[PDB]
From a paper:
Here, we show that a novel Mn-dependent peroxidase is an important factor in tardigrade anhydrobiosis. We crystallized the putative globular domain that lacked the N-terminus 62 amino acids of g12777 protein (g12777-Δ62) and solved the crystal structures as two forms containing Mn2+ or Zn2+ ions at 2.30 Å and 1.60 Å resolutions, respectively. The functional assays conducted here suggest that g12777 is a manganese-dependent peroxidase, independent of other components of the cell.
The Zn2+ g12777 protein structure was found to be bound to five Zn2+ ions originating from the crystallization buffer containing 300 mM zinc acetate, but not to Ca2+ from the protein buffer (2 mM calcium chloride). The Zn2+ crystal structure of putative catalytic domain (residues Gly63–Leu231) of the g12777 protein displayed a characteristic β-sandwich fold comprising seven β-strands and three 310 helices with three disulfide bridges (C91-C97, C146-C225, and C176-C200). As for the Zn2+-binding site located at the almost same region as that of Mn2+, the side-chain oxygen atoms of Asp92, Asp98, Asp161, and Asp163 coordinate with Zn2+ ion at distances of 1.9–2.0 Å. A considerable conformational difference was observed between Mn2+- and Zn2+-bound forms in terms of the metal-binding site, in which Asp92 and Asp98 were commonly involved in Mn2+ and Zn2+ binding. These aspartic acid residues were highly conserved within tardigrade orthologs, and the highly conserved CD-CD motif containing two Asp residues (D92 and D98) was used in the metal ion binding in both structures, suggesting the importance of these residues. The cysteine residues in this motif (C91 and C97) formed a disulfide bond in the crystal structure, suggesting that this disulfide bond may also contribute to this protein’s function. ITC experiment demonstrated that the estimated dissociation constants of the catalytic domain of the g12777 protein and Zn2+, Mn2+, and Ca2+ were 1.92 × 10–6 ± 6.00 × 10–8 M, 2.42 × 10–5 ± 1.75 × 10–6 M, or 1.39 × 10–4 ± 3.02 × 10–5 M, respectively, indicating that the binding affinity of Zn2+ was the highest among these divalent cations. The recombinant β-sandwich domain of g12777 protein (g12777-Δ62) showed significant peroxidase activity when Mn2+ ions but not Zn2+ ions were present. We have also observed that the g12777 protein utilizes Mn2+ ions for peroxidase function, while it has a higher affinity for Zn2+ ions.
Residue numbers in the entry: 66 to 226
Write the structure that this text describes.
Amino acid sequence: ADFFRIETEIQRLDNPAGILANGKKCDFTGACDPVVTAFLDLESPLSPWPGSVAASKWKTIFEATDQNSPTIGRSVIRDMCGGSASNVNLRVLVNDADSLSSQDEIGKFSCLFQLDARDVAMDSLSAQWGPSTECTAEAQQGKIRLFARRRAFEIPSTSCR
Ligand SMILES: [Zn+2]
Ligand SMILES: [Zn+2]
Ligand SMILES: [Zn+2]
Ligand SMILES: [Zn+2]
Ligand SMILES: [Zn+2]
């Protein structure tokens, strides 16, 4: 397919200890205040975090106060127009809201998804969501966890943004 939509979903964050990537408690309370930014990387999906485009340019997808393990259920959508792509990386940064610039992040996650022919449905109604997939973290792997899933489907060229 040369014109298709990639839909990814940040399903949830699970941080039962209430800790940052350096292993210390959020705000030294363990009462984390997650701010989730994200970017769907089609140009450098196999490169080190953060890929093609710096996290400073990412849009905010979700905020909560005093939620260690929030349900998120928010989508990050990009179109591939005029040709093929074989993978895409949903890059996610989670900070605590407090001392944004200074406190270590909660996490740096890479949700790498394949886009083989079988992964791109002929249309949105026949698209199947892939399974809930644990994103790869720079630190605290299996202690601070992010879950995402993707679907993809052909769209008319005139709707390909
Ligand atoms: Zn072609
Ligand atoms: Zn949990
Ligand atoms: Zn969902
Ligand atoms: Zn905080
Ligand atoms: Zn760090």
